[PDB]
Design a protein around this ligand. Sequence first.
Ligand SMILES: COc1cc(-c2ccc3c(-c4ccccc4)[nH]nc3n2)ccc1O
Length: 274
Amino acid sequence: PLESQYQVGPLLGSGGFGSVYSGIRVSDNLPVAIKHVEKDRISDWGELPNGTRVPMEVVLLKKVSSGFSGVIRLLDWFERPDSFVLILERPEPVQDLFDFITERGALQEELARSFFWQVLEAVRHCHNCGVLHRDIKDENILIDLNRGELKLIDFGSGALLKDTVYTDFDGTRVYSPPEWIRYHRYHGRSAAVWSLGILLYDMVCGDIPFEHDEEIIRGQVFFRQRVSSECQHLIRWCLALRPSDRPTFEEIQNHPWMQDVLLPQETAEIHLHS
Ligand SMILES: COc1cc(-c2ccc3c(-c4ccccc4)[nH]nc3n2)ccc1O
């Protein structure tokens, strides 16, 4: 039982990530996070080996929880009469990237580079395990302050990665690409590159570039902060209106702006205990 091996605590973020509470694995006092989702509110279901009917979030989580510390890992899960319970890693201390940027404003390019590199690595990992996140944004990224490591969270809007067209989407609209707004269809990788474009802009500029469908459709990027030419090119590239014109992950990590990133621990020593 859950009440048996974990000591449940208060809600986290007052409903920021939905119904997730802080907890402790009582056997070793491991900090965990405990997410509840009720069956009635589940739109997308999956099948686990051995045929157990389970929310897609769990299949995706099982596939990406391999020990790579770029994504928050699923330690365990339980089924209850009317809901499901997830036990997840809880970094300590930790801060959400959205709150980090809010408090700090536009990040210095050295720091945005380290962060953005880590996020790419995490997304590459997901794709390699057959998972498309679909909700990449600052709110879904945690910072492990001690180690300077970023971690992806919230795979609730995710899908199995496929090479064919997607026609559904339940993520954040201002992070969605022109194809979705205009046609309600997209391909996984080029849409993910678009959202990464939005994310990077948010990091260097302190906010998102588009607030309405029309701004997204137009694809004009105005920079309100001082941003290097190299970084501007990368952002404008990811935010190409035509999916085909967008870079591949390899092209992004080979971009000149991306060269000579800091190691996560270096990043923490320089920027996190500033
Ligand atoms: C990796 O997959 C998922 C992860 C989460 C999620 C959310 C908040 C989390 C915190 C935390 C700890 C302290 C403060 C704030 C957050 N720690 N670990 C978390 N995990 C929720 C759904 C998912 O599918």
